[PDB]
Structures are given as C-alpha cells and as structure tokens.
Amino acid sequence: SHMDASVMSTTYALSAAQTEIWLAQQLYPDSPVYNIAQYTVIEGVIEPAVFEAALRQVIDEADTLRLQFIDSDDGLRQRIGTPAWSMPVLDLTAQADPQAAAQAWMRADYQQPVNLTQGPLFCYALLKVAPAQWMWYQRYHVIMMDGYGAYLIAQRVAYVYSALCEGTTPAECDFGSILQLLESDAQYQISAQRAQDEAYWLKHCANWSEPATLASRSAPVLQQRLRQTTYLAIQAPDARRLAQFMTAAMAAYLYRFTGEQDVVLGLPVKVRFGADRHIPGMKSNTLPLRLTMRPGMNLSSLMQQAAQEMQSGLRHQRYPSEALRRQLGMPSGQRLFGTTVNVMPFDLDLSFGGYSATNHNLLNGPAEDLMLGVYWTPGSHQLRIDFDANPACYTPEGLGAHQRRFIRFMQVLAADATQPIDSIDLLD
Ligand SMILES: CCCCCCCC(=O)SCCNC(=O)CCNC(=O)[C@H](O)C(C)(C)COP(=O)(O)OP(=O)(O)OC[C@H]1O[C@@H](n2cnc3c(N)ncnc32)[C@H](O)[C@@H]1OP(=O)(O)O
DSSP: OHHHHHHHHEEEEEHHHHHHHHHHHHHOTTTTTEEEEEEEESOOOHHHHHHHHHHHHHHHHHHHHHHGEOOOSSSSSEEEOOOOOOOEEEETTTSHHHHHHHHHHHHHHHTTTTOOOTTEEEEEEEEETTEEEEEEEEETOOOOOOOOHHHHHHHHHHHHHHHHHHTTTOOOOOOOOHHHHHHHHHHHHOOOOOOOOHHHHHHSSSSOOOOOOOOSSOOOOOOEEEEEEEEEETTTTOOHHHHHHHHHHHHHHHHHHHOOEEEEEEEOOOOOOOGGOOOOOOOHHHHEEEEETTOOOOOOHHHHHHHHHHHHHHHGGGOOOHHHHHHHHHOTOOSSOOOEEEEEEOEEEEEEEEEEEEEEEEEEEEEEEEEEEEEEOTTTTTEEEEEEEEEOOOOHHHHHHHHHHHHHHHHHHHHOOTTGGGOOOOOO
C-alpha cells in the first residue's frame, strides 16, 4: 500500500536511546513511568497571553516539541509534525488549599497514559496559587525530552517571556534542530567511535555481579516512583566532585547494608558533546560505575575510585547501557546496576519578566529499583536529595528510614574523610 510507503518516505528512524525507550514502554503500554515533569514557581505576576506567545515561540525554536510518532513495518518512526496543543490556565486562589489543588491537578496530568502516536507528548499549563504566585507546569515523555533538554527549554521560555514583557525582540535562539541530533546519532551507530566505546565497556564490565541493592526483591517497574525528599545544607566542590561524593557515599551505604564489595551503580550522563549541547531532545544515557569495597577504605579512597571511573569512562559515554547488556550476553531482565546516582547540577533559578522563579522536579523517569536524585544549583549552599524507588520494592516508611540513615551516614563520612566506612555507626 502506498500509504505505508509514504510513511517510510516522510519519517526518520528513532535514535538508539529512543528505541530503548520505545521497547521498554511497549512492555507496559499503560505504565506512565516514562514521563518527566517539573514545575517552575514564579514569585510575581504572569500575563498568560504573553506566556502563551513565549511558548509558541519556543515550540518553533525547539523542534523536538513538534515531533510526531507514526507506527511502521520497521517499528516506530518520527517526523517534524503539527501537534495539537493548548495551555490550560487555572486560577486556584479561591480554593481552600490552592497549593494542594495545584499539586493534584499536575499529578492528574502526569499520571495520564501517553500514547506515542496520538499525543500530546508534552503539556504546559499555568496555575495561579496565590496573589503573585504562579506555577508553570511542564511534562514530557522521555522519548522526546531528557532532563538537560527540559532545563534548556525552561531557560529559553523565561528569556523569551522576559523580552516579550519588556516589548523587545528576543535575541536569536541558539538551538540546533532535532533532525541534526538524529542524523548525528545515526552516524554514531555505524561509526568507529562506537566500536571503541563498545570495546571499552565490554572490558570494563566483563565480570559482573548481580547488583547490590537495599530491596528484598527485584521487579520491573510498572508504577510511578515512591519519592522521599530531603533538603540538605551543603556544609554536610563542583558537579564532578559532588557526583564522586554521592556515588562513593551510596556505594559505602550499600556495602554496609548488604556486605557486597563489588558495587556497580548507574550514573546518568548527558551525552551532549559539541553541537548537541544546544539541541533540546532525548540524549541521556546511564553508565555502569564500579566501586570495589576494599578492606579498610575510607571516603577518600572511594572518591579516588569514583574519580578514576569517571575520568576513564566519560569519554565513552555514548554507548547505550542497554546495548552493553545485550553484548555482554546478560540474561533477560538482569540489570548491570540496581541503584542509580543521578546528579543534576542544573541551575534551578529563572527570571520571568523581572520576577524570581525556581524549578522543582515532579517526575524523573522510571525507578527500576532505587534512584538517588540530587538537584544542585552550582555554587548554591543547598541540595535537594530525592530517593525515588520502585513501589514493588520499597515502602514509603522504609524508604524514609533509608534516606534518614543515608543522610546521617553521608554527613559522618564528610566529617572525617580518613575514617574507615566499616568504623561508622549507622542509625538503624
Ligand atoms: C521535566 C523535568 C526534568 C526531569 C529530568 C529527567 C531525568 C532523566 O531521566 S534524563 C537525565 C538527567 N540527568 C543528567 O543529565 C545527569 C547529569 N549528570 C552527569 O552527567 C554526571 O553526574 C556528572 C556530573 C559526573 C557529569 O560530569 P561532567 O563534567 O558534565 O562530564 P561530561 O561533560 O559528560 O564528560 C566529561 C568527559 O567527557 C570526555 N570527553 C570525550 N570527548 C569529549 C569532548 N569532545 N568534549 C569534552 N569532553 C569529552 C572527556 O574525557 C571529559 O573529561 P575531561 O573534560 O576531564 O577531560
């Protein structure tokens, strides 16, 4: 049939990362766990018609927002399309609990199933929760947006809105096109770079243990994450050393609870080199990071190991960890890591028409087991630490107990970096 021929002729293949997302989503086409979402709280007055004009401009500028997915013989295909969208504006200020009402509205959306061929794949909404307090809600399916991409979009919307508010022309966007990102990925899939990367990871992981984990069971994730959130003063570094510390601390904690001495963690990374640093879309990967719990090691030796792992492996970060699992001949369902340490050193602050604003994550993708999410504006004296967990594997209270124990443990670690991790009392 000519209609199938025309679909193939007018579309692009999924990238490697998108393909892994599509396959995972196909296993549970009703699981909403492939959404990411956040809201930006603005301390001021937002004019919705100007905000919507800013969103129209950024939907033109970031063409990943206009991707449409179409089923095909060779699987899912995509093109720059004409997605239907609107921007709900809800004034909740007369409600008994406007904040709770806003959270419930956002939650109702990000729990909605997202059919990839019908969309909508993103949602933008404005919620007024007090006099001079607005929330801009942002939701994406990860097949077309990752964390850094969402950050780029929020920065650009704030800038464009600010220009439109003051009646000036926004300076030209520095975004590249998603089609260039897809073409570069297609070339990488058949490049020599990829073969070197594959060799590196096959060597690095070639003798693997079943992952160390705090859970009594491992299970696919079907449900949205259980989340425990704690805010931490930084007195308890740059992004790289914050990641070194967080991975070392989580590995030491896993070792103290399970005794496992070969600890493999997941390290989400941006996979954004060169031009791809300016293209909103889905690029990110998650790397296996191995830390060997030796007899007597302290925090310093562990962060030494983590720094070495990152210096050795970040250059090879393009190689998808799912492809790595297949190439290693791992059994179906078996993972290289259970616990992931997702450090997001992305500026949380924005300015909208001269009004201060801050970003707050709602969903950060699927929680297969446990994910430590760390949100830090570089330079700030404050961290947000999320424990995101598979509800099939943890309880809210058990997760909260783990998070309190972990926060205390990590503070005692940072208090004396020469002290043996075996010598530290926990909270139990
Ligand atoms: C809607 C709300 C949003 C929801 C969020 C969505 C959540 C998701 O599921 S998506 C993932 C979100 N998380 C992230 O993006 C994680 C970001 N964090 C990280 O990447 C790691 O924690 C972190 C901090 C260690 C990365 O450190 P970083 O310094 O940025 O490393 P990175 O730039 O990637 O690579 C550096 C290394 O790459 C190597 N490299 C190879 N080629 C190059 C090249 N052309 N250029 C530069 N470096 C290169 C180098 O060896 C380099 O090392 P060095 O500069 O010292 O010589």
